[PDB]
Design a protein around this ligand. Structure first.
Ligand SMILES: Nc1ncnc2c1ncn2[C@@H]1O[C@H](COP(=O)(O)OC(=O)[C@@H](N)Cc2c[nH]c3ccccc23)[C@@H](O)[C@H]1O
Ligand SMILES: CC(=O)c1ccc(C#N)s1
Lengths: 333, 326
């Protein structure tokens, strides 16, 4: 049997070119090489308060976007987290092998808490434990994520090792799969802050379903630097904006940073932004054309969710049975 | 009938205080209320413990509740982990529970997240079954208040999804104090086990513990009820009264001119007489694997039918895409 890939994305906010280059691009590329399982994590999404109509619509938007990206339900398992009870069941059990201190020091908990001061809820605190359960249920070997989820992924490894040390080889210890390009795509007007799928300022983001014409204008207004003469060179510390533009271009076109720096010799930020805008506009035009074909086909989305939850349940029920046997529960008849 | 929810820990060995107080009270109210008894194995694992002992203790607890007279045809009795909806609702309710509410619980770096987060699972345990009444000890009144706050908060956003549970106010009326500390209530959790009589203790064990039970230095010895001045003798009278149904004044009359050895002898005989039918039922039920399997299966099926209806309404209110059944 092939090694197992697992990853997820939240049906909340609006997925960006950051979410694509950090995660979804790798998801699509891994589908023949590994046994891939991809999840729409609606139980994680509600750690930030959602409107009920927007959450239901966003779950189906996210599913159609996975399909539009090239996630193939004949090759990959695609399912909605809340459809598989084992996630919450294993999440509770793993709370008992996770320390309070490990959770309080999490960067996501701190950042989301500062943003949503009026809804610092237990779900937002307990986020990493349910995420560990999501991964460990599927005997997962690789977890393709962006740089921002590295800390959560490291806790899931700590939990797996801690549980295995007491009970035996119940879980696989998962490894991160973080890409070389586009692991941390930055905000267009604040290039020291990562691109957010829920930014109050839309001018910071390249949304995967945004009007390409709107995206081209935002790229042209992306902040660069005061360098005289202007030079197209990758340097995060001194040239955050220009570096972010080169990272995006590299990720879309497949061209290396040395290749792009050579291409832009004797050229300035007009040429760079022109090439970023053209590459991104083309990618989003084609992606969006595939998206609407899937998104408006409710019979197809309904079948993908049904088949996916069925495949996921078979794997998850096997792992949870072993966890429950190990910790000493009377087995359900 | 109103729905009543009780969580039964699979660890504590029950005492005559547990039985003659709350359990006997509730055994005789199974036709008055829809009583639910949930053996809370998912709560137990917040304290690291031997796995085989936890499996054993789950079955020990099921058999003893059945032996005490919980009727699986009248009441719903099941193992918590057999009903996924508990964990499912508990995660959902985490997202409507303030971090501050769990921080402010009366009860930090090396506490496990289970010991921090279990009040939310307790809220889910109650709210799943549209529970009207919860019998709580003083120790879990804060937990019931959080469950009520979560229910009202969720209902305020989404409509009347949950019943707001109430504490079951009226108490048993049977008083059972610690044998070597009669000011302290006889507690299953008591570290000193010479203070307690467990429901599975043999007649020789009961004689030994009752003979050590503290009394007083009154001369002549006098069997009279007086909690302030004669806490020990008063406790022995309350235990004998709870077993036999004889009034305190009748027992004071019965032990006129009698010494504390006579009282102790009759307390031990009365208690062991009560524990005979209980222990006979226990050892019969505990060693009938097919009977315990059938009770757990039927109980989980009844619980799941109710729990699934509540969870479906919660999931619909939150806006989750409904699962596609195969
Ligand atoms: N600016 C950015 N640049 C590059 N990558 C980025 C950027 N912003 C976000 N990402 C990545 O996008 C993925 C989805 O993010 P979500 O917030 O939906 O979703 C999250 O952040 C996960 N906790 C959801 C999850 C739940 N359970 C799991 C189990 C395995 C893997 C992932 C999960 C993520 O991989 C994230 O790293
Ligand atoms: C019952 C409850 O509170 C939970 C279920 C899954 C969790 C995680 N992680 S917490």
């Amino acid at each position: 049997t092939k090694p197992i890939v697992f990853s997820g994305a939240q049906p909340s906010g609006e997925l960006t070119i950051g979410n694509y280059m950090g995660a979804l691009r790798q998801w699509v590329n891994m589908q023949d090489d590994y046994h891939c399982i991809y999840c729409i994590v609606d139980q994680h999404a509600i750690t930030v308060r959602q409107d009920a109509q927007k959450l239901r619509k966003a779950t189906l938007d996210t599913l159609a976007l996975y399909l539009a990206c090239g996630i193939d339900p004949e090759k990959s398992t695609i399912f909605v987290q809340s459809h598989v009870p084992e996630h919450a069941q294993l999440g509770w059990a793993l709370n008992c092998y996770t320390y309070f201190g490990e959770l309080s020091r999490m960067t996501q908990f701190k950042d989301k808490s500062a943003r949503y001061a009026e809804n610092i809820n237990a779900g937002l605190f307990d986020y990493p434990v349910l995420m560990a359960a999501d991964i460990l249920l599927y005997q997962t070997n690789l977890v393709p994520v962006g740089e921002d989820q590295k800390q959560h992924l490291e806790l899931s490894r700590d939990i797996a090792q801690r549980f295995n040390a007491l009970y035996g080889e119940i879980f696989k210890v998962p490894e991160p799969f973080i890409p070389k390009s586009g692991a941390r795509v930055m905000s267009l007007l604040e290039p020291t802050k990562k691109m957010s799928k829920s930014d109050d300022n839309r001018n910071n983001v390249i949304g995967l379903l945004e009007d390409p014409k709107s995206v081209v204008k935002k790229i042209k207004r992306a902040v660069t630097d005061s360098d005289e003469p202007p030079v197209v060179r990758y340097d995060v510390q001194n040239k955050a904006g220009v570096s972010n533009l080169l990272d995006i271009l590299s990720a879309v076109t497949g061209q290396s940073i040395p290749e792009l720096e050579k291409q832009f010799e004797g050229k300035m930020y007009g040429h760079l932004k022109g090439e970023v805008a053209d590459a991104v506009s083309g990618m989003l035009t084609e992606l969006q054309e595939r998206y609407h074909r899937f998104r408006n086909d409710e019979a197809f989305l309904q079948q993908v969710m049904k088949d996916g939850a069925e495949k996921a349940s078979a794997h998850a029920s096997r792992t949870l049975k072993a966890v429950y046997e190990a910790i000493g529960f009377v087995a359900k008849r």
